[PDB]
Amino acid sequence: SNFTQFVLVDNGGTGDVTVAPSNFANGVAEWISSNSRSQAYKVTCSVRQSSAQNRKYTIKVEVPKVATQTVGGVELPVAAWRSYLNMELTIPIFATNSDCELIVKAMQGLLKDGNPIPSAIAANSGIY
Amino acid sequence: SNFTQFVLVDNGGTGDVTVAPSNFANGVAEWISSNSRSQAYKVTCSVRQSSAQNRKYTIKVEVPKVATQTVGGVELPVAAWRSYLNMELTIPIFATNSDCELIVKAMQGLLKDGNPIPSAIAANSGIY
Amino acid sequence: SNFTQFVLVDNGGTGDVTVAPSNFANGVAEWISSNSRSQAYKVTCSVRQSSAQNRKYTIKVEVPKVATQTVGGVELPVAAWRSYLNMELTIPIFATNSDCELIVKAMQGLLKDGNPIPSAIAANSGIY
Amino acid sequence: SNFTQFVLVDNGGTGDVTVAPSNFANGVAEWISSNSRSQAYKVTCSVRQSSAQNRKYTIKVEVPKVATQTVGGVELPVAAWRSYLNMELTIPIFATNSDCELIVKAMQGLLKDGNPIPSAIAANSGIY
Amino acid sequence: SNFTQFVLVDNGGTGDVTVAPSNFANGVAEWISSNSRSQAYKVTCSVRQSSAQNRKYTIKVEVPKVATQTVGGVELPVAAWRSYLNMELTIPIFATNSDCELIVKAMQGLLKDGNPIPSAIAANSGIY
Amino acid sequence: SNFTQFVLVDNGGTGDVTVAPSNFANGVAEWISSNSRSQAYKVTCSVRQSSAQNRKYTIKVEVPKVATQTVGGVELPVAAWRSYLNMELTIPIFATNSDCELIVKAMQGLLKDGNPIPSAIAANSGIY
């Protein structure tokens, strides 16, 4: 199985956010971190044949801003807000395993530390 | 500037795919790899205030399947096909720099080697 | 590359507010402080050939009054209010670099500590 | 009683431009250098409560084109020989003297020598 | 990182005209000489995919009329004192780096000293 | 008679592409390489008093990508594709011959090997 738990956020070996399998209904795999579902991280993924020659992945991630809500003196564990990552990857059925491995490296390279994009995001910025 | 060239695909230090700035029209930054524009990798990125409380990034990547087209004896350098990655990241304006750095780690963790998602893609698979 | 960070508010090395490059989309250079976008200082600058014989620089600075606000029982980093500076400077195309250095000094002298204008502003007073 | 003569352009004691009170009609303070009104350095300043929550300072400065100028001469068109600065400072009625002093520092910093804005202006440039 | 200062007019070390980066608003790189904008040498350059099969470079150059020029002066009409060069290079997406290098050589040859075109221009002539 | 042949592409004495005078009908000087008209390089130039105070040179170069195509079972010498350079140069009638030699050198410097523009073109790249 590849439907297992994994470390979403690596913070050294402590304060690491681990996301564990939760549900696989209708071809949409879901992973959630522990504790209150209200303050949890969430990852979903599905694949479908989008057209005759294409297969398409739909991956989603939610990173919460963990907070406490106090109303009328009753406090609940909530997420003050959340960021929503939505990605779609279209891959022709002609792609071999080698081709797919390259696509994966391209995605890891895009987000690698120090590169333009992850630097812009991490600093509340755009391109300049 | 963060509008510079970077390594999209790291293949050791050789066969590395480098993508260089090409155009920044209308708030959409574009990067393209060298040689025929027809066989080039492409990365674009833009940010906008999607709503009152949210800023939204729209990142896109194209990985080509490099090939030669022969028609009537005239051959042209083409991409046999392409994979299309489309990602959107929504981040509330309340996020500090610390919050954004965490969002970035969550994205790098999702795609890290060995984790469920990059393993499924790299092997032409889904979750099981 | 004059697009660099600078200290907007100099509180003598301690509690200085530095502002850094964060976007150049649409030809508007932007700089924001290291804060959540809801509490950051912001500076923008753009130049345009406003007429056949002029060039116009539009510069804006936003100075926030930061607060923590309880919305829906949850605390959010917020700006109690913001002060806005909007400046436009029109320079004829016939102006030499030394003619331009003259404009910069005039603007620096205008706001020097002790002079009429910065004294009125700092005291919630008018000129008299 | 701040309505007094001051050094507008500091050329280090030799060839400084001093501007002196010249009009107070309607509460608008005016200061001009010792020149013809066509070639004079001119500064005017007024305050008014712009709305129920704001006070606004309107400061205007006129600077002469000095290179190739004929002192005391008739130089036409007037627009080829003069630069106009127009500043508007909106300050909320809650701003204390301290808040106002910080606003004056923000203005002094924006125009300080070596910073982006004054460097661009002096070099007949935009931002790059 | 090719956005750097370069010698536009080579007069053999003495009296060469150097042009330096001065603007990057919107991805259009600009370079100007150290003059007033009315008397400056100016170069701008941008690339865009003009259509589905072509990429296009738009290069513009402004050259000042130097004979009888008054440095730093106001010279009107603007049109009597400036020459404008406008180049458009359309390159099919199939062109490799090698194809592109040959195109650059074709441009270098077209303008080389002693050839018809540069001789005609320099002599205020047409073809005969 | 400046209407002479010249080497358009200099491949160092071997495989040089020389172009020769071939038509002057309608006041458009033309030069084509020694090939079938379907595969020849072509250069045209015309000058016209575009306005009362200008002269405009229109210059075009066509660089073919030669191929042999089988049409109806028969082979024909053909051009797989063509690259087109279109240049217009507007010069005021007040320009001296030395003012004109200045324009020629500027065009030669612009395309010199190693300079930004010919480097971008040869690499299927933009300026960055």
JSON list of C-alpha atoms in Angstrom, two decimals, chain C residues 104-105 107-109, chain D residues 106-115 117-118:
[
{"chain": "C", "resi": 104, "resn": "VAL", "atom": "CA", "xyz": [15.98, 64.72, -4.11]},
{"chain": "C", "resi": 105, "resn": "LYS", "atom": "CA", "xyz": [17.79, 67.13, -1.80]},
{"chain": "C", "resi": 107, "resn": "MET", "atom": "CA", "xyz": [12.65, 66.58, -0.58]},
{"chain": "C", "resi": 108, "resn": "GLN", "atom": "CA", "xyz": [15.19, 65.61, 2.05]},
{"chain": "C", "resi": 109, "resn": "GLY", "atom": "CA", "xyz": [15.47, 69.17, 3.38]},
{"chain": "D", "resi": 106, "resn": "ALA", "atom": "CA", "xyz": [8.81, 58.37, 7.74]},
{"chain": "D", "resi": 107, "resn": "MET", "atom": "CA", "xyz": [8.95, 61.36, 5.35]},
{"chain": "D", "resi": 108, "resn": "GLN", "atom": "CA", "xyz": [12.53, 62.19, 6.25]},
{"chain": "D", "resi": 109, "resn": "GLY", "atom": "CA", "xyz": [13.55, 58.55, 5.61]},
{"chain": "D", "resi": 110, "resn": "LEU", "atom": "CA", "xyz": [11.70, 58.23, 2.33]},
{"chain": "D", "resi": 111, "resn": "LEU", "atom": "CA", "xyz": [13.77, 61.16, 0.98]},
{"chain": "D", "resi": 112, "resn": "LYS", "atom": "CA", "xyz": [17.03, 60.54, 2.67]},
{"chain": "D", "resi": 113, "resn": "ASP", "atom": "CA", "xyz": [20.13, 60.53, 0.56]},
{"chain": "D", "resi": 114, "resn": "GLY", "atom": "CA", "xyz": [21.08, 57.21, -0.91]},
{"chain": "D", "resi": 115, "resn": "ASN", "atom": "CA", "xyz": [17.60, 55.70, -0.60]},
{"chain": "D", "resi": 117, "resn": "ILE", "atom": "CA", "xyz": [13.29, 57.28, -4.35]},
{"chain": "D", "resi": 118, "resn": "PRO", "atom": "CA", "xyz": [15.69, 60.25, -4.14]}
]
